[PDB]
Design a protein around this motif. Structure first.
Motif, PDB file in Angstrom:
ATOM      1  N   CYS A 147       0.823  -1.199   0.000  1.00 45.04           N
ATOM      2  CA  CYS A 147       0.000   0.000   0.000  1.00 45.04           C
ATOM      3  C   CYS A 147       0.864   1.258   0.000  1.00 45.04           C
ATOM      4  O   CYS A 147       0.645   2.164  -0.807  1.00 45.04           O
ATOM      5  CB  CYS A 147      -0.949  -0.028   1.198  1.00 45.04           C
ATOM      6  SG  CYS A 147      -1.913  -1.575   1.294  1.00 45.04           S
ATOM      7  N   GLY A 148       1.858   1.312   0.881  1.00 43.49           N
ATOM      8  CA  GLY A 148       2.732   2.469   0.913  1.00 43.49           C
ATOM      9  C   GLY A 148       3.438   2.666   2.237  1.00 43.49           C
ATOM     10  O   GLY A 148       4.662   2.798   2.278  1.00 43.49           O
ATOM     11  N   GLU A 149       2.670   2.715   3.311  1.00 45.29           N
ATOM     12  CA  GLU A 149       3.231   2.934   4.641  1.00 45.29           C
ATOM     13  C   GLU A 149       4.086   1.761   5.103  1.00 45.29           C
ATOM     14  O   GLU A 149       3.813   0.601   4.778  1.00 45.29           O
ATOM     15  CB  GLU A 149       2.124   3.188   5.668  1.00 45.29           C
ATOM     16  CG  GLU A 149       1.076   4.188   5.216  1.00 45.29           C
ATOM     17  CD  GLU A 149      -0.152   3.513   4.648  1.00 45.29           C
ATOM     18  OE1 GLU A 149      -0.020   2.735   3.675  1.00 45.29           O
ATOM     19  OE2 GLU A 149      -1.254   3.741   5.181  1.00 45.29           O
ATOM     20  N   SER A 191      -3.899   3.096   5.505  1.00 50.37           N
ATOM     21  CA  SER A 191      -4.491   2.301   4.455  1.00 50.37           C
ATOM     22  C   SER A 191      -5.226   1.087   5.015  1.00 50.37           C
ATOM     23  O   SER A 191      -5.920   0.375   4.287  1.00 50.37           O
ATOM     24  CB  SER A 191      -3.401   1.876   3.486  1.00 50.37           C
ATOM     25  OG  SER A 191      -2.297   1.316   4.181  1.00 50.37           O
TER      26      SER A 191
END
Length: 30
Positions: A4-6, A15
């Motif tokens: 997702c990113g984090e 997210s």
């Protein structure tokens, strides 16, 4: 099964709201 990113190092998975969850130290979803 997709990043997702984090990163669960210093950043909480915002997210998670969309099903993202810590996996391999990184927030992943599907």
């Amino acid at each position: 099964g997709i990043p997702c990113g984090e990163s669960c190092v210093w950043i909480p998975c915002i997210s998670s709201a969309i099903g993202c969850s810590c996996k391999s130290k990184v927030c992943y979803r599907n």
